[PDB]
Amino acid sequence: GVSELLISTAVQGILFALLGA
Protein backbone atom coordinates (compact mmCIF):
# COMPACT_ATOMS: atom_id res chain seq x y z
CA GLY A 1 0.00 0.00 0.00
CA VAL A 2 2.88 2.40 -0.77
CA SER A 3 1.13 4.02 -3.76
CA GLU A 4 -2.11 4.42 -1.76
CA LEU A 5 -0.18 5.76 1.27
CA LEU A 6 1.47 8.49 -0.85
CA ILE A 7 -1.90 9.67 -2.24
CA SER A 8 -3.43 9.59 1.27
CA THR A 9 -0.60 11.80 2.58
CA ALA A 10 -0.96 14.21 -0.37
CA VAL A 11 -4.68 14.87 0.27
CA GLN A 12 -4.21 15.03 4.07
CA GLY A 13 -1.22 17.37 3.44
CA ILE A 14 -3.23 19.98 1.49
CA LEU A 15 -5.96 19.79 4.17
CA PHE A 16 -3.34 20.25 6.93
CA ALA A 17 -2.16 23.50 5.29
CA LEU A 18 -5.70 24.96 5.11
CA LEU A 19 -6.75 24.21 8.72
CA GLY A 20 -3.09 24.56 9.86
CA ALA A 21 -2.85 28.28 8.97
UniProtKB/Swiss-Prot annotation:
Effect of changing G20E: reported as: In SPH4; Benesov
Tissue pattern of expression reads: Detected in erythrocytes (at protein level).
Q: How is it modified after translation?
A: N-glycosylated.
Q: Where in the cell is it found?
A: Cell membrane; Basolateral cell membrane
* Spans through the membrane: 1-21
Subunit arrangement? Answer: A dimer in solution, but in its membrane environment, it exists primarily as a mixture of dimers and tetramers and spans the membrane asymmetrically. Component of the ankyrin-1 complex in the erythrocyte, composed of ANK1, RHCE, RHAG, SLC4A1, EPB42, GYPA, GYPB and AQP1. Interacts with STOM; this interaction positively regulates SLC4A1 activity. Interacts with GYPA; a GYPA monomer is bound at each end of the SLC4A1 dimer forming a heterotetramer. Three SLC4A1 dimers (Band 3-I, Band 3-II and Band 3-III) participates in the ankyrin-1 complex. (Microbial infection) Interacts (via N-terminus) with P.falciparum (isolate K1) aldolase FBPA; the interaction inhibits FBPA catalytic activity.
Q: Which disease is it linked to?
A: Ovalocytosis, Southeast Asian: An autosomal dominant hematologic disorder characterized by ovalocytic erythrocytes that are rigid and exhibit reduced expression of many erythrocyte antigens. Clinical manifestations include mild hemolysis, intermittent jaundice and gallstones. However, the disorder is most often asymptomatic. Spherocytosis 4: An autosomal dominant form of spherocytosis, a group of hematologic disorders characterized by the presence of numerous abnormally shaped erythrocytes which are generally spheroidal. Affected individuals have anemia, jaundice, and splenomegaly. Clinical severity is variable. Some individuals are asymptomatic, whereas others have severe hemolytic anemia requiring erythrocyte transfusion.
Q: Which family does it belong to?
A: Belongs to the anion exchanger (TC 2.A.31) family.
Role played: Functions both as a transporter that mediates electroneutral anion exchange across the cell membrane and as a structural protein. Component of the ankyrin-1 complex of the erythrocyte membrane; required for normal flexibility and stability of the erythrocyte membrane and for normal erythrocyte shape via the interactions of its cytoplasmic domain with cytoskeletal proteins, glycolytic enzymes, and hemoglobin. Functions as a transporter that mediates the 1:1 exchange of inorganic anions across the erythrocyte membrane. (Microbial infection) Acts as a receptor for P.falciparum (isolate 3D7) MSP9 and thus, facilitates merozoite invasion of erythrocytes. Acts as a receptor for P.falciparum (isolate 3D7) MSP1 and thus, facilitates merozoite invasion of erythrocytes.
Q: What is this protein called?
A: Band 3 anion transport protein
Q: Which species? A: Homo sapiens (Human)
Q: Which gene encodes it?
A: SLC4A1
* Whole sequence portion shown: 436 to 456 of 911
